[PDB]
Amino acid sequence: YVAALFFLIPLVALGFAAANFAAVVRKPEGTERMKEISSYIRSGADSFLAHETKAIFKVAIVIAILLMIFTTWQTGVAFLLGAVMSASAGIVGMKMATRANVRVAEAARTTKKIGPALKVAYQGGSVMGLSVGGFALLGLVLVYLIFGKWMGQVDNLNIYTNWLGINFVPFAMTVSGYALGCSIIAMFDRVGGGVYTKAADMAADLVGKTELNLPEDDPRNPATIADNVGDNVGDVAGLGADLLESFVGAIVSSIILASYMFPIYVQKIGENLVHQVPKETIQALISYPIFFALVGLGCSMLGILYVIVKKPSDNPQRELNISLWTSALLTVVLTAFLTYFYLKDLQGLDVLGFRFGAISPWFSAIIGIFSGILIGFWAEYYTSYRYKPTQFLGKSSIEGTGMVISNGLSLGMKSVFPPTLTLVLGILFADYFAGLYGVAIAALGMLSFVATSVSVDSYGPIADNAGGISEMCELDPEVRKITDHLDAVGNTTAAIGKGFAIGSAIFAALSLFASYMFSQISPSDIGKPPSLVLLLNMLDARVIAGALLGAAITYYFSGYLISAVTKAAMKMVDEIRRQAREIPGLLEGKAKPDYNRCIEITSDNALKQMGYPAFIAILTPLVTGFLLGAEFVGGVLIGTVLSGAMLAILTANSGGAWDNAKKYLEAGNLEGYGKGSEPHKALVIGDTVGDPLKDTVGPSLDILIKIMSVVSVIAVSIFKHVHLF
Amino acid sequence: YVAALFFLIPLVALGFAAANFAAVVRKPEGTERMKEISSYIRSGADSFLAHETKAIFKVAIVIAILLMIFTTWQTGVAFLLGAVMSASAGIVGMKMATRANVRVAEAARTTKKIGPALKVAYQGGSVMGLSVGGFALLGLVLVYLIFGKWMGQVDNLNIYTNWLGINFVPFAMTVSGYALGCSIIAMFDRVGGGVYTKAADMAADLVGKTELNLPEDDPRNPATIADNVGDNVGDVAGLGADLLESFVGAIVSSIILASYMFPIYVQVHQVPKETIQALISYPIFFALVGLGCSMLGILYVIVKKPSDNPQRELNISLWTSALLTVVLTAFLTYFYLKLDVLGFRFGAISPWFSAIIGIFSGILIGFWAEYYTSYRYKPTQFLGKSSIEGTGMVISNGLSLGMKSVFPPTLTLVLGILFADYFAGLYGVAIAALGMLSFVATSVSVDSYGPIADNAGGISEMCELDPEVRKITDHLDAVGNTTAAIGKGFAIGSAIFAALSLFASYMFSQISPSDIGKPPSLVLLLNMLDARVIAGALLGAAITYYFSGYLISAVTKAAMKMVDEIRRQAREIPGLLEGKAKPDYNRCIEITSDNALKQMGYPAFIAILTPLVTGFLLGAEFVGGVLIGTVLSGAMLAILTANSGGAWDNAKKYLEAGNLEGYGKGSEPHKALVIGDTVGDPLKDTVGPSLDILIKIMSVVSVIAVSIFKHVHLF
Ligand SMILES: NC1=[SH]c2cc(CNC(=O)c3cc4ccccc4[nH]3)ccc2N1
Ligand SMILES: NC1=[SH]c2cc(CNC(=O)c3cc4ccccc4[nH]3)ccc2N1
Ligand SMILES: [K+]
Ligand SMILES: [K+]
Ligand SMILES: [Mg+2]
Ligand SMILES: [Mg+2]
Ligand SMILES: [Mg+2]
Ligand SMILES: [Mg+2]
Ligand SMILES: [Mg+2]
Ligand SMILES: [Mg+2]
Ligand SMILES: [Mg+2]
Ligand SMILES: [Mg+2]
Ligand SMILES: [Mg+2]
Ligand SMILES: [Mg+2]
Ligand code: NA
Ligand code: NA
């Protein structure tokens, strides 16, 4: 029927991405030096991503075997499917960007205008965004059809108990495994690529600009190629992995709640269970988020096509915002129709959530979108150098490096507010509209047009690489100005994407707190009213202690990521100093440096440090539970949500502001002081201090939130009574 | 009987502090240049503290009148009493330090050893700590005797409702007003002094060391005198205010919970009135025993043979005070309390155990502080080493060190909460919150010891003395920074415990006389799955972060103003850098004073209003969520900022001791460490301390005012 037409949308999106790749590759590349630089960066990125993928997939096979042992095999199969999906999205994005960077560079060089370069960069971004959306929805639909339909886990959806004494719902456990695989692979990719790129960027920027007195991404700098390999590895593949994980997480949270609703909402009447809701309603609610995501992917495809066929403009932010708005409006309308018709007459919504009938979920979704948009706007206010905060930061740059650091930290901590209030209002409204199911539907709708968001976000790194390639090949300063404008727009878009991701994570984390309080129910007491089930008393000393511990664990995770970055940062700083002083004629320009040193340093550090964060995110719930019950784990989840949201928003805004103020000063817009002045060095120090907090901690925080919440939701059935205290 | 002997302890502490002040003043000060510099610094500190005190006391009178209007007059009277108590403790500490700085400096200069300077600095610190403890306990005992005994508010312990629809217990409301006044005055003092001193320090350090290439606190630097006046204003008066506020807040939380326990635990009252009265009076006797043990430890450490390692002497003081407190409080709990229905599961000794936790917790925190802040350990030394790689490296490694150190103390607090709960419910949780500050006198002493050493070093460097004097001052100042970090940890831990206890008291206060029968098991219930509660938690975390950011910005404004002023002076006054001209310290003094006085008001009003607005907007669950998020985020940020600022400052000092191989005071690593120290100053001396004050003030205001918007909410 129409379900098949909907389920074929992800394949159309993947085909569109492949077509965009074929079109960009058919574009003309640059000169011979441009080809050589692109080859260097592409080879580095390919090698590091190959090593990362091998390691991550070994770990993924191990985790899949464990999941198969301790739960149903369907869980392990879904885990592997999600791992493959996220890894493939990341690899596709990286393999597309490694080729589109030089294309954008050559376009901006020949045409001397922003239109063509913007168009090619948006083509690459669309490749990655369509790949992400299509992979996520394809994995989800394959799971829903094989383990939900072919095997019929969506038909029984009952509370079984496995051999290890674990209470589980079949389709619930399968989607949990799928989301866990997605999020764990995304965690590995993000941590690795972030460590790599941020160490390289810190070392190169700091040493070169502040000490050696070189231009940004100068060929004499033995770390520039490492920096660009990181831009392609950590800022692309990791970005796609994280965003696909967020999309799949919102959708799987909605689906898990819908599935768990059926066997719990029952009435015990003389030892006879009477289901308060018909199975058809739960099945409609389960299939609803998938159709929602498919309609959203279609609307994103429409907007991306309109923006890639439209006449190019000189203001790239205008084009990106036009794409986002068109996708969002198409999604709103088509999803209104989908919610009205699909949920027409179900007869069981009143019992759970929806108070305004079939349209109740749609409203929630709307909230999400709007919420996201709001955050987006706020991002552009705090990150863009065309507004008050970033400009005041750039001005304060005249007073000293310490002034820059303090003002950046204050700007981040202040910007923490408006988006948090947006999320508060969104939570309240989605609740009022359709309970926790609508909370999850809003989490999803905030990313309903995830394809366009991922596209507009990945657009940036391509422009950054184009600028790096133009600087390495000594191009016309007009090319550098085009790349700098595109890169500022890309920083704004990356801040917007981080905000979107963190908001979706918070919404899905509330929905998952609900599902986690649900999973604790055993078949023995499968009759108590959900009003008593969904209860996590905060006055229980265990819960508040767990909240404290979760906040501390989030902060320690961020600190460990920062330290893992700074280790390689210092190593490469020292290596660059050594090369500058021990290689004859390197600074004069008559000698070639050794980029391989920094490449290998960053690769080794990233490969060594990428493992611990994922394992922490996987184990923390299990250990905390087996030590102090399930209320402590609930408190830990609460504290994790709070601290992670706060730190992620703060770091995203602060890093965006710092980088855009550095770029604004580099454009000479700072009266009197140029690109080589002491204020520029202070802004460079600020940008290096913002780099690791913007490209590592922030993104990884939401992945940690979702991974930990999913692990707890899956494993609470055990430590609920197998605790030590 | 023996109760009068107990009620006389705070007066003895105040007398001991006055005697220590008279003894330090009887010591010989330095030369004419030292006398002139000390007089200038004392005049500046006195002037700024006078203005700050006048403004804060006008605001305090206004707030007391408002409290009298909307609640009982006893609340306003106790508010004024606590305001006066905290302001007096701070002013006494500051007036003692402004005179003890030059005395410590001259002692360390003449003796050429660390012993005499350490002894005099600890004398000043003991003056301030005894002042704080004595004033806090005297105000609290006067309230307990006048409104608790003379008027007998501890006799009825009923749930009344005032004309504005507020449910309250008489003595509960009175102690709430006292603690609220204490915390609001501490908030004003802390915010003002922190802005002042941190702006001055940022300006001076950055401009002088990074640009003009001058030594720390050089007379040519027109901000060194302003920086030291700030050290005396914000790091002394504010410190005493904050610590007295935490002490009184723990005790008042204990008292409020004890009072509210009676009329709620009914089936017929589940607990006899005598038991509730004994539990109400118990925290006061506990605090008195703790003050006595702190006095004993301070006396032993000021009479004990001086050592060359001052941290050893300070740790010996802390250990002796803590052990004396543990033993004497064990005896007090055994005899005075010579329960099962509420909390205590091990009989009369149940509360004492909890207190122990607190103490030990504090002690534990102490070690962790000394592990992360002292340059004699791995983290601070690694930071100093990373200083060779660049300023950005210093900043990133400092942030990482703070965020990691955030953990061990958090786990300590988690275990303490869990164990105190297991032992004696929320009453024992609050008693542990208090016991962590049981020896608050010794803690305040060891903490105020630091700023005195900082001022002595600044004065010795201003007069160009013997480098041995500067080395003595640097060692003492590093020890003082470590002790200040330990004190901040003490405050934040006590704040977390008391904030949980106040969450309990706030869930209790919502009970109205109409439904004064529901089982307490159902009353103490704040479901976290309520969308409103989680939204409020998110909003509270965001509000804490914005509070911190606004404080940082208030600091950076005056910091930039003074940086520009110093550059202008350097370029337009002939011979200033050459040394043939005299700078204008009054300019920086006035800049920082004006900025601090202007920015000093808003944070306290935010902390006071946020609960009221959030409540009248979204019921009581939203306010509960806001309190939870605020507590969590504030604890995290306070621990992080304290540890990070300590690490940065001690790494700078570790590089100053030459322990960094090859690089001296003028090398790029020293400039990077100075940039790190300037970035840490505002996060260490302004945000961190204000966070726990905000937590306590907001939770107390909520506990008092929830009775209105609990059902008079807009949604
Ligand atoms: N129009 C309608 S009535 C209706 C009823 C149900 C199932 N049980 C109930 O609501 C139910 C209400 C209630 C109140 C007190 C005690 C026990 C109770 N049990 C589900 C859908 C539906 N739709
Ligand atoms: N419209 C209506 S109210 C109503 C009430 C009753 C009798 N008690 C119940 O059903 C009932 C038991 C139970 C246990 C847990 C959660 C919810 C529950 N509900 C039966 C039918 C009916 N139909
Ligand atoms: K970027
Ligand atoms: K200090
Ligand atoms: Mg850079
Ligand atoms: Mg880059
Ligand atoms: Mg670049
Ligand atoms: Mg950038
Ligand atoms: Mg950068
Ligand atoms: Mg300083
Ligand atoms: Mg000082
Ligand atoms: Mg000083
Ligand atoms: Mg100091
Ligand atoms: Mg300082
Ligand atoms: Na995410
Ligand atoms: Na405090």
Residue numbers in the entry:
A (entry chain A): 2 to 726
B (entry chain B): 2 to 268, 275 to 345, 350 to 726
Show sentences the authors wrote.
Membrane-bound pyrophosphatases are homodimeric integral membrane proteins that hydrolyze pyrophosphate into orthophosphates, coupled to the active transport of protons or sodium ions across membranes. They are important in the life cycle of bacteria, archaea, plants, and parasitic protists, but no homologous proteins exist in vertebrates, making them a promising drug target. In all these structures, mPPase is a symmetric homodimer, with each monomer consisting of 16 TMHs.
Here, we report the discovery and synthesis of the first nonphosphorus, non–substrate-analog inhibitor of TmPPase, N-[(2-amino-6-benzothiazolyl)methyl]-1H-indole-2-carboxamide (ATC), its preliminary structure-activity relationships (SARs), and a 3.4 to 4.0 Å resolution structure of ATC bound to TmPPase. However, only one ATC (ATC-3) could be located at the interface between chains B and C as the density in these chains was weaker. In addition, at the gate of the TmPPase:IDP:ATC structure, Na+ is pentacoordinated by D2436.50, E2466.53, S2476.54, and D70316.46 (bidentate to both carboxylate oxygens). This is mostly because the sodium ion appears to be translated by about ~1.7 Å. In contrast, the RMSDs/Cα for the other loops that interact with ATC is smaller. Comparing all the TmPPase states shows that the binding of ATC causes the β1–2 strand of chain A to move away from the dimer interface relative to its position in TmPPase:IDP and TmPPase:2Pi to roughly the same angle as in the resting and Pi structures—when the exit channel must remain closed at all times. ATC is thus an uncompetitive dimeric inhibitor with a clear preference for binding to the single-substrate bound form.
